[PDB]
A paper describes a structure:
Pf4 exists as a prophage in PAO1 and encodes a homologue of the P2 phage repressor C and was recently named Pf4r. Li et al. demonstrated that repressor C, which they named Pf4r, was responsible for immunity to Pf4 infection and also regulated replication of the Pf4 phage by repressing the expression of xisF4. Central to these effects of the Pf4 phage in P. aeruginosa is the repressor protein, Pf4r, which not only controls immunity to infection and phage replication but also acts to regulate the expression of host genes.
However, we were successful in generating high-quality crystals for the Pf4r* mutant from which the structure was directly determined and from which the Pf4r structure was modelled. The Pf4r* structure was solved initially by single anomalous dispersion (SAD) and then by molecular replacement (MR) to a final resolution of 1.97 Å in the space group C 2 2 21, yielding an asymmetric unit containing two protein chains (A and B). An Arg to Leu substitution at position 80 (blue spheres) maps to an exposed surface of the protein on the opposite side of the dimer complex from the predicted DNA-binding motif and also well away from the dimerisation interface. The mutation in Pf4r* to proline at position 4 may mean that only weaker hydrophobic interactions can be made, and the homodimerisation may be less stable. In contrast, Pf4r* eluted as a monomer with a molecular mass equivalent of a dimer as determined by MALS.
Author numbering:
A (entry chain A), B (entry chain A): 2 to 80
The structure:
Amino acid sequence: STPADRARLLIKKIGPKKVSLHGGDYERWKSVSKGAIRVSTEEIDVLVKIFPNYALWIASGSIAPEVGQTSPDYDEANL
Amino acid sequence: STPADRARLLIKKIGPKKVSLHGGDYERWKSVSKGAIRVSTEEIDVLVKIFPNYALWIASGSIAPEVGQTSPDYDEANL
């Protein structure tokens, strides 16, 4: 996967409330969600405020549980 | 700092050779370098291929040497 696919996977699961509380535009956010527009550093910034544990996975697709860097599938599998 | 500032710090230090060998457009790369255009996931993808140890720092501004995630200033200070 690309960083954009991993970012969009998280973007598709966040609505106006969490986007607004972490300081993003929702209108842009929805256009990124749909694929209409490229994921920028702006979206990465909001996601890493929302999901600080996913910052490594977003950028690289890898995880490091040793330093509290996980992924959505990892957290789901770890419940 | 933002992810865009940290990305541009690395983008400003990479020329056509390393950009091309990791599969990016240089013309876009230079427009991102100058600030003319937003840093996208495309630039993050090339940077994390070039600098896999900086993927966490690019996304979050933090480091984790425990898992080989560093920064430019950290590596320079560690010589």
